[PDB]
């Protein structure tokens, strides 16, 4: 893998020229007139393109990992982001896409690489900033990296992902993306992030229009005939539902979109993931709210939940039974008065 080593050296050298330049040219401070490096003049995009293509293969990934390929690619992505900012320049967008694709491939299934990339704080900030790119393809690539980093995140990674503002940035991104594949990556990352801590759940719920959008995903209609968006949107909803349950304003947003009625339809889904997410959401929404308790009674929820308590899937079993016992502990007056 001598050519690969050569390509990594090409990009490390280019980064070195960039860092030296950044160090020696602080705006407002005395400095020479030597020009800022441009990646187009050093064949950078072709190099990262070749690396991105090789990174699909586990054998080339092994050879990259021995050579420190992840750090070299991350450093290039970071430095181009710092030098040029949010640009629509095709060359810059293309190099950042290819760098991100490689980072996605190099983090997949790879505990050590995820840890390394999260430790690159400057790179993590650069990644989060790219979610505002006008290139939806770049947004998809960045969300893919964040999805992988957020999966099985260690304590340090969880903290870094939170501190760089990935949650708010991804939720805001979700509200505007057009393609299903971008949305899949963005919601998958959010499904992972929303399980990490209470603060991430709050941050999602705080974004203007986020809850309505998540409720909307429960009835998303895939043009590719998959259930990935309903599963991920519903998975985020389940994870933040513990907070929704104690916020009347947020419950009202759900009501305006007939959320409870949709979750009951989800109990009859042929997808266990969809059923599980619905059971988890109902577990929370069925607690400590007379209005939504009565609504669930009225919509026949008791029988639907009772149907699931023998399931044998931990979360369907747990959630269905917890929702059922909430409803049974809170039989509405109009049922009690009617005997």
């Amino acid at each position: 893998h001598h050519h690969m080593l050569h390509l990594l050296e090409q990009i490390r050298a280019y980064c070195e020229t960039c860092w030296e330049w950044q160090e020696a040219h602080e705006p407002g401070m005395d400095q020479d007139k030597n020009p800022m490096p441009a990646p187009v003049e050093h064949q950078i995009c072709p190099a990262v393109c070749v690396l991105m293509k090789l990174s699909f293969d586990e054998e080339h990934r092994h050879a990259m990992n021995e050579l420190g390929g992840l750090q070299a690619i991350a450093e290039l992505l970071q430095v181009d982001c710092e030098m040029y900012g949010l640009t629509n320049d095709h060359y810059s967008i293309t190099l950042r896409r290819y760098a991100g694709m490689a980072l996605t491939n190099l983090t997949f299934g790879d505990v050590a690489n995820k840890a390394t990339l999260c430790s690159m704080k400057g790179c993590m900030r650069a990644l989060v900033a790219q979610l505002k790119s006008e290139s939806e393809d770049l947004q998809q690539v960045i969300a893919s990296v964040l999805r992988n980093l957020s999966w099985r995140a260690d304590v340090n990674s969880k903290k870094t992902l939170r501190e760089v503002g990935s949650v708010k940035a991804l939720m805001e991104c979700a509200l505007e993306v057009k393609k299903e594949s971008t949305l899949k990556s963005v919601l998958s990352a959010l499904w992972n992030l929303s399980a990490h801590c209470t603060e991430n759940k709050a941050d999602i719920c705080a974004v203007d229009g986020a809850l309505a959008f998540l409720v909307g995903t429960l009835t998303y209609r895939s043009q590719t005939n998959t259930l990935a968006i309903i599963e991920s949107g519903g998975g985020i909803l389940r994870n933040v539902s513990s907070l929704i349950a104690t916020n009347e304003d947020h419950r009202q947003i759900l009501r305006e979109n007939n959320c409870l009625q949709t979750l009951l339809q989800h109990l009859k889904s042929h997808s266990l993931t969809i059923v599980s997410n619905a059971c988890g959401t109902l577990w929370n929404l069925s607690a400590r709210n007379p209005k939504d308790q009565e609504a669930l009674w009225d919509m026949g929820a008791v029988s639907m939940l009772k149907n699931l308590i023998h399931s044998k899937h931990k979360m369907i079993a747990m959630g269905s039974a917890a929702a059922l016992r909430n409803l049974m502990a809170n039989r509405p007056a109009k049922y009690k008065d009617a005997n």
Partner: peptide
């Protein structure tokens, strides 16, 4: 739960 998983890059 973290149901989001992980995935390779889209070609």
């Amino acid at each position: 739960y973290q149901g989001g998983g992980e995935e390779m890059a889209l070609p």
